[PDB]
Design a binder for these strands. Structure first.
Lengths: 416, 218, 990
DNA sequence: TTCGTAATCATGGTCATAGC
DNA sequence: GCTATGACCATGATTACGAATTG
């Protein structure tokens, strides 16, 4: 057969292959399903740092010409592309952002299809665009229209030189002071004029330092991040709990550090340690206290409170009584969509800031005695699941979790 | 560039090394039939059944295969005409002209284009008939098509009823698309544009495409 | 004008019709031609929105359409089914078109023809001549089948015609080919409408040099020089190859009713056609009854393994018993000799002894009723007789009694009184006789070929293929030539469509279905006690009826990924969906994250699948009851065929419920059926295990309670029996699956076993089970050794048997034809199995003693065989077919053939069957570790002799032998210990 | 479907290199 | 200083292909 639908579908398949990301699921599943479709009808079918080179750390001469300089920030790199969802490194998790950013991204993609993707550098729940690659045109358009929308843009630099330029540490420090931005820095990206290859430079050196302890500080609602303090008292910028948990730092000891002109960042562990994860996580937890559990990239409380979380998550003012609570929920019309479209148990999960995997593998290990849609008693069966102290902390706070579940069931039944 | 001797006509086959590993067994599938082939006059002559064996197989990507040579004036190599009289070659030349856009052409040999092999399933036919030598060439067609499949990526079959059971024809699953009958009612071959489907299929396995305009002779 | 239908078939021209072949009472054959249309089911709104009016429209009437898509729910708020009631029309048109909103797009047009016109495929009909127009000789045309086939008359008997054929070609080293090997003999069995049966055989004279033609003519044979001067009355005809092929073409072109040949579609007919075309430019032509379409013979393939079919269009049915045997029955081997051995057998007595031959007698007073008659009927053309599955005897003299037979067979004297006789393999070397061809060899091969031809007739009468074809055509609503061609998914559409039309329902699947994704081990292998067998009466159909599992009766499916929501969901299910109106079934979760899946089924209104299964079961029961009181043999055969057809069709529903492209696909229904079946078998196995029978009481180990919901039945485990009070019996449970259950009892008296089996079956049926679940006693097994139901050996006593009865030696799983192990291996395996069976029956055994016995027997035998080296080479002689279709790089077998060819003047072609063995120099002693054994492979010719500086490498043969032995037996650790001590390797159990 | 034989891989050690 | 981990070795193990059970 020579149906035009088949050839249009084949071009769609090649376009999908050219736009395949391993992180995405819907596009990957659709492409794979079309692969089985083709290999059933035709008996066979032919089927991150791609634009980035190695980072330069030693001074060297560069070719005279037009340079676009953009500072590459400290933080976690996340990705977003067309025809997909939010994309990040490794885990594939998700998070909540208001839809006006989605509308802005739709405007970005449909106004210009040449932009490859939009990547963000993430830090302390302040979340700003840094750089992106556009094949068709120069990268000016994307951030000029971004700042046109209202969001802040990096202080780009355009330098035209007609002779050889020497890129040493001192001139890098001059440019960094020229940026004069208090946010942490890690490198500089320099872009040619008419070349799609993207290249970056980071100047660094290593030394030894002494720590005092590791504490935790507040970022936002329930958001807590640990930080290690040094001899000089400078605040050491920890990426997340994952960074420290793979750093495997030892207390009261000197450790290597990658020192900057103004900063001194603790780098990834390069040793040959053989200590396993268990006793060291118990050590760090008992050092930091029983009230802390690692829910991924941050920590969380264990406090009782109880009633003082729904109003925060229902985006409404303080409430005092369940009756006036349900009355306010009834009168406020924009809310019942969220409470209706979404289930009960997971609502009590995000209400208390619990991690999905640990909590689900914990709840799948007890027995629950209930009555009239109300949980009244629970008892544990297996002890091995408690080998993680975070599991122990969640089991301890299950007493508050039970009341939270009971009251959310109360309000759900009362409303309808 | 070696050669093998045969008991019956043409008494000698010269060949290229790319057919070496299997063509040997060919002889004890040819001596059992050549006695009955030579009883009736055949097209082409006995000296040109195996001239297609010259072409190597280390630089070919997609295969075009026919069902039977022309009953008259066949010259071994398939899908060609020195005088350009046959209907099928005219139809394929017109299709290629319409696809590429070139409007002038007087000769079109599928052998000129690189990456393609003009092939026929049955290597003989008596004049005045069609596919009258199937039983004589069945096992030879088995061996030759399977050996071709070991290198070619995409298979294109011309014909509806003749190639309706190619799924069980081979043993190694390779992509295969069947064309339409060269004399189909309603001129269904005119609407056929399978060549860009072939090209886009050859895109997905990451191989160099083929250009048809070089095959035209002006 | 009363006719009975025989076949319906298609025309495949530019204009297509439907053909009916029928026979009258006198014997006339009548063909009827109908116009064949394309059928469509539409609704009223789409019917009135068709701008080009259809050819004809018929109002089906009120119909109810139900969506049967399945959706996963995570809560307890379930959306109900969407049901639409509307007027529906059935339209008929000559040409194919696409309709955007056409339902019932899965049923064939021939089924629509049958159901809409109300025509049974095989009924007897009194046609009206008003609607029939004569268009040719014997062919009529009818355009209004509604009124022509209105009259129904009772079934009457009609004559029939048959042709059975056999071919014998020439070969010396390899499989015959058309180009170099001619046809030597061709045998026919011919039955015409007059009922007279003729047998004849044509022999080519090209190999029988003229003195032998003259001697044969003087002896009584007939010679012909032309096609027109041969008569079918003469038993033997000597002619040339061209005349033989011409006669074959003439015979195959006749308008027969059945042309039956064993594997004739792949070899015999293809060889005849190819040779006929090769010798002369002549074809075999099949012509349509109206004489406007002609076709040639071209066998074509089909995938189901590979099957071959004939492209005839005259109405004759070309039948191959090979394909029918493969589809209908599961067997160890599909050789013609093995099938004949399993089919025809009798219990014979010794009447004379002495010399090299003895006399055997058989009658209805020795074995059974009708078996001796079948053996006598087969004996008319038989030549070799197999006795004791070991001895092959050449028949010297035979005669047929009034109710039996007598033979004399040349065999060594063996002193017993009763043996068993059967027709099996013949120790005849065709290749040897072809090397020195004479007249006597020609006559012997002629009688061999005529026996081969008549064997197809014997098998056809034995299996009742004619009545089975009629019953399948009547039940499945399909033409007689299409009954044994398709799978279960195609034969279910007729009765399903009839059910849907009578219950006026339509099922619609509106979403692209997703790509969604057990053996039982007996407790011990050896028993040394009695094993009672009970059979479930169609467990899956009855469980589907009990649960009312249908795609349209599914209320919903509830999933839960954590135990808190699982518990609250269970509470809500018990509050909202209580028994007995609703039934809730647990199933294994369909997704990795889900931990619980519960399907809910309604029982207020009977579904669709349960109704079909109930109808099938009731019809089968009625046909069995009618067969029981039948007198005529023809009526008994018809009723048996009908009940067999119903049993076959009723057992395909469970497989179709799990088949994605089937018309009854339902994931949840299949999962629920499997779950309830497993729960029932587990409950019965639990309650039977540990049961005791003492005094006048019988006690079960667990409470006789319904395992789904509470019932009003008494649940007291203690049951009063009617057996004598002196018995003290203890029962155990070993094996149990969907089809049957095994119960172990520690006694060797079989009369007590069968009486207790009957009483226990009665008590289980009356007291333990519930609703419509029943079991029936099957048999008593003695000396049972099993790995599974696939592989076991034992002695079987039927339910209707006494102690003084001949046991059935049931033995399957083992091949005895898998021809690449050895000759010593098979014989010594047989010896060891016999030895195991003989000390199994002593009684004072227990378990870990017979392992030791077998281990030291193997030790002694292996030591003696290795030390003596007295076994001849041919007992260790292996075979392999040679071909060049080898992948990879080297595959050193080809290389070995190369040096054999270049080292020996003898040359192996690419189609020979070459003999090989394992050889090693004699200087090596017994080894423990093994190496690459292909290096030790040697090829053995006819003239090769074992030299003095090498010997047979016994280690591989003995390792395989002891491996198969250790696959048996019960003890575990001592087995690995022995295998380590002898060979130092890990055995591959199971 | 089973049965058989290579090939690959991972749970039992050992030792050369090398760190608190 | 010994005890720690990389490249080396194999017993015991599952996983893989092969090719017959075809006629």
């Amino acid at each position: 057969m020579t149906s035009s639908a088949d050839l249009t579908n084949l071009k769609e398949l090649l376009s999908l292959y050219k736009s395949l990301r391993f992180s995405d699921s819907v596009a990957i599943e659709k492409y794979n399903s079309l692969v089985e479709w083709g290999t059933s009808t035709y008996w066979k079918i032919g089927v991150i740092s791609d634009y980035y080179d190695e980072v330069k750390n030693k001074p060297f001469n560069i070719d005279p010409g037009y340079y676009i300089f953009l500072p590459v920030y400290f933080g976690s790199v996340f990705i977003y592309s067309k025809g997909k969802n939010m994309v990040e490194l490794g885990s594939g998790n998700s998070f909540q952002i208001p839809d006006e950013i989605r509308s802005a991204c739709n405007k970005v993609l449909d106004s210009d299809n040449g932009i490859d993707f939009l990547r963000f550098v993430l830090l302390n729940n302040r979340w700003i665009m840094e750089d992106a690659i556009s094949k068709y045109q120069s990268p000016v358009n994307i951030f000029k229209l971004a700042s046109e929308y209202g969001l802040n843009i990096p202080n780009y630099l355009e330098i035209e030189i007609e002779e050889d330029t020497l890129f040493d540490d001192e001139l890098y420090s001059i440019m960094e002071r020229s940026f004069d931005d208090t946010f942490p820095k890690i490198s500089i990206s320099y872009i040619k004029l008419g070349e799609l290859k993207r290249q970056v430079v980071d100047f660094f050196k290593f030394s030894f330092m002494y720590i005092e302890s590791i504490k935790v500080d507040r970022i936002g609602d329930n958001i807590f991040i640990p930080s290690v303090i040094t001899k000089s008292g400078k605040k050491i910028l920890v990426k997340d709990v994952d960074h420290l948990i793979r750093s495997k730092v030892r207390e009261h000891t000197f450790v290597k550090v990658k020192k900057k002109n103004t900063f001194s960042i603790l780098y990834d562990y390069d040793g040959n340690g053989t200590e396993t994860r268990g006793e060291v996580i118990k050590r760090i937890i008992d050092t930091i206290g029983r009230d802390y559990y690692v829910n991924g990239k941050y920590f969380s409380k264990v406090g009782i409170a109880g009633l003082k979380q729904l109003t925060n998550k229902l985006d409404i003012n303080e409430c005092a009584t369940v009756d006036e609570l349900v009355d306010e929920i009834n009168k406020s019309g924009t809310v019942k969509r969220k409470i209706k479209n979404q289930s009960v148990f997971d609502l009590s999960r995000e209400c208390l800031g619990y991690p999905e995997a640990d909590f689900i593998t914990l709840v799948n290990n007890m027995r629950f005695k209930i009555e009239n849609c109300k949980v009244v008693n629970f008892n544990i069966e297996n002890t091995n699941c408690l080998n993680n102290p975070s599991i122990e902390t969640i089991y301890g706070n299950f007493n508050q979790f039970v009341s939270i579940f009971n009251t959310v069931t109360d309000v759900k039944k009362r409303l309808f | 560039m070696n050669s093998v001797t045969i008991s019956h006509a043409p008494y000698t086959i010269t060949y290229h090394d790319d057919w070496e590993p299997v063509m040997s067994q060919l002889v004890e599938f040819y001596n059992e039939v050549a006695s009955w082939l030579l009883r009736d006059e055949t097209s082409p002559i006995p000296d040109k059944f195996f001239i297609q064996l010259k072409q190597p197989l280390r630089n070919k990507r997609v295969c075009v295969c026919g069902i039977d040579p022309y009953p008259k004036d066949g010259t071994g190599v398939p899908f060609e005409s020195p005088n350009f009289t046959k209907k099928s070659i005219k139809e394929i030349a017109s299709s290629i002209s319409r696809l590429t856009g070139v409007i002038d052409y007087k000769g079109y040999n599928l052998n000129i284009i690189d990456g393609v092999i003009p092939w026929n399933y049955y290597l003989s036919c008596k004049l005045g008939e069609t596919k009258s030598h199937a039983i004589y060439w069945d096992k030879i067609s088995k061996l030759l098509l399977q050996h071709i499949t070991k290198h070619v990526s995409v298979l294109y079959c011309l014909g509806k009823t003749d190639f309706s059971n190619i799924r069980a024809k081979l043993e190694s699953p390779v992509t295969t698309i069947v064309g339409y009958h060269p004399a189909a009612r309603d001129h269904q071959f005119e609407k056929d544009r399978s060549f860009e489907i072939i090209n886009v299929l050859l895109e997905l396995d990451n191989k160099t495409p083929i250009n048809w305009a070089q095959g035209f002779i002006y | 004008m009363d006719v009975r239908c025989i076949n319906w078939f298609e025309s495949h021209g530019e204009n297509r019709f439907l053909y009916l072949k029928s026979r009258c009472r006198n014997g006339e054959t009548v063909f009827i031609r109908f116009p064949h249309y394309f059928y469509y089911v539409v609704t009223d709104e789409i019917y009135q929105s068709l701008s080009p009016p259809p050819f004809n429209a018929r109002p089906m009437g009120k119909m109810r359409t139900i969506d049967i898509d399945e959706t996963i729910s995570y809560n307890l708020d379930i959306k109900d089914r969407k049901c639409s009631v509307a007027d529906m029309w059935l339209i008929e048109e000559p040409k194919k078109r696409s309709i955007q909103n056409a339902t019932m797009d899965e049923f064939f047009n021939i089924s629509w023809f049958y159901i809409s016109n109300g025509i049974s495929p095989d009924g007897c009909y009194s046609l009206d001549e008003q609607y029939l127009t004569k268009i040719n000789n014997g062919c009529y045309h009818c355009d209004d089948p509604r009124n022509c086939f209105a009259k129904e008359i009772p079934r009457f008997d009609i004559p029939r015609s048959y042709l059975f054929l056999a071919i014998a070609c020439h070969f010396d080293k390899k499989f015959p080919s058309v180009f170099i090997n001619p046809i030597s003999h061709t045998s026919y069995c011919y039955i015409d409408l007059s009922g007279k049966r003729l047998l004849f055989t044509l022999i080519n004279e090209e190999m029988l040099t003229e003195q032998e033609i003259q001697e044969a003519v003087d002896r009584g044979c007939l010679r012909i020089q032309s096609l027109m001067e041969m008569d079918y009355e003469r038993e033997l005809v000597l002619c040339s190859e061209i005349v033989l092929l011409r006669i074959a073409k003439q015979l195959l072109e006749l308008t027969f009713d059945y042309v039956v040949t064993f594997n004739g579609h792949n070899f015999d007919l293809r060889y005849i056609t190819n040779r006929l075309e090769l010798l002369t430019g002549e074809k075999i032509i099949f012509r349509s009854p109206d004489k406007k379409e002609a076709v040639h013979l071209c066998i074509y393939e089909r995938n189901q393994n590979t099957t071959f079919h004939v492209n005839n269009n005259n109405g004759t049915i070309f039948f191959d018993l090979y394909s029918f045997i493969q589809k209908s029955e599961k067997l160890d081997s599909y050789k013609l000799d093995s099938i004949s051995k399993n089919a025809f057998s009798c219990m014979g007595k010794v009447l004379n002894r002495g010399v090299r031959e003895m006399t055997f007698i058989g009658d209805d007073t020795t074995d059974a009723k009708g078996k001796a008659d079948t053996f006598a009927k087969v004996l008319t053309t038989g030549n070799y007789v197999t006795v004791d599955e070991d001895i092959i005897c050449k028949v010297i003299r035979k005669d047929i009694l009034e109710n039996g037979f007598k033979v004399v067979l040349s065999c060594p004297t063996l002193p017993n009184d009763i043996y068993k006789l059967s027709f099996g393999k013949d120790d005849i070397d065709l290749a040897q006789m072809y090397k020195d061809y004479n007249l006597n060899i020609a006559l012997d091969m002629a009688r061999y070929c005529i026996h081969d031809a008549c064997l197809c007739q014997y098998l056809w009468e034995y299996y009742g293929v004619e009545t089975k074809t009629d019953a399948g055509a009547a039940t499945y609503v399909l033409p007689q030539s299409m009954v044994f061609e398709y799978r279960a998914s195609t034969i279910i559409k007729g009765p399903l469509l009839k059910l849907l039309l009578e219950t006026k329902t339509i099922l619609v699947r509106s979403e692209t279905k997703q790509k969604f994704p057990k053996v039982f081990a007996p407790k011990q292998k050896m028993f040394s006690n009695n094993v009672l067998i009970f059979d479930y009466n169609s467990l899956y159909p009855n469980v589907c009826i009990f649960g009312n599992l249908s795609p349209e009766t599914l209320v919903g499916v509830v999933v839960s990924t954590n135990r808190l929501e699982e518990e609250i969901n269970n509470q809500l299910l018990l509050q909202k969906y209580p028994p007995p109106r609703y039934i809730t079934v647990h199933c294994e979760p369909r997704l990795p994250n889900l931990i619980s899946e519960i399907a809910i089924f309604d029982r207020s209104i009977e579904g669709t699948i349960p109704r079909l299964l109930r109808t099938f079961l009731a019809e089968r029961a009625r046909y069995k009851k009618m067969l029981k009181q039948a007198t005529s043999s023809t009526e008994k055969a018809i009723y048996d065929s009908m009940q067999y057809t119903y049993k076959i069709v009723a057992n395909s529903v469970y497989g179709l419920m799990g088949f994605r492209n089937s018309a009854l696909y339902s994931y949840a229904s299949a999962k629920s059926c499997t779950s309830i079946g497993r729960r029932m078998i587990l409950y019965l196995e639990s309650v039977l295990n540990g049961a005791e029978l003492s005094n006048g009481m019988l006690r079960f180990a667990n409470t006789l309670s319904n395992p789904f919901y509470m019932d009003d039945r008494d649940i007291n485990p203690i049951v009063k029996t009617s057996l004598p009070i002196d018995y003290r019996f203890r029962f155990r449970s070993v094996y149990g699956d969907t089809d049957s259950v095994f119960t172990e009892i520690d006694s060797q008296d079989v009369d007590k076993s069968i009486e207790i089996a009957k009483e226990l079956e009665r008590l289980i049926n009356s007291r333990v089970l519930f609703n419509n679940f029943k079991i029936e006693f099957e048999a008593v097994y003695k000396n049972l050794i099993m790995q599974s139901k696939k592989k076991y050996t034992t002695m079987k006593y039927s339910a209707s048997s006494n102690s003084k009865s001949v046991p059935e030696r049931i033995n399957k799983g083992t091949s005895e034809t898998r021809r690449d192990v050895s000759k010593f291996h098979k014989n010594m395996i047989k010896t060891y199995k016999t030895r195991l069976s003989e000390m199994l029956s002593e009684g004072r055994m227990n378990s870990n003693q017979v392992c030791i016995d077998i281990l030291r027997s193997l030790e002694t035998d292996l030591r003696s065989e290795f030390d003596s080296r007295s076994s001849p080479l041919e007992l260790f002689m292996l075979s392999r077919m040679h071909h060049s279709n080898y992948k990879s790089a080297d595959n050193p077998n080809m290389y070995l053939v190369t040096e054999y060819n270049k080292n020996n003047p003898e040359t192996i072609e690419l189609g020979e069957r070459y003999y090989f063995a394992y050889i090693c120099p004699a200087n090596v002693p017994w080894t423990k570790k093994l190496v690459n054994i292909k290096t030790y492979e040697t090829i053995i010719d006819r003239s090769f002799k074992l030299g003095s500086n090498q010997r047979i490498f016994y280690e591989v043969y003995f390792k395989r032998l002891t491996s198969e032995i250790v696959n048996l037996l019960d003890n575990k650790v001592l087995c690995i210990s022995f295998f380590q001590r002898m060979f130092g390797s890990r055995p591959t159990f199971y």
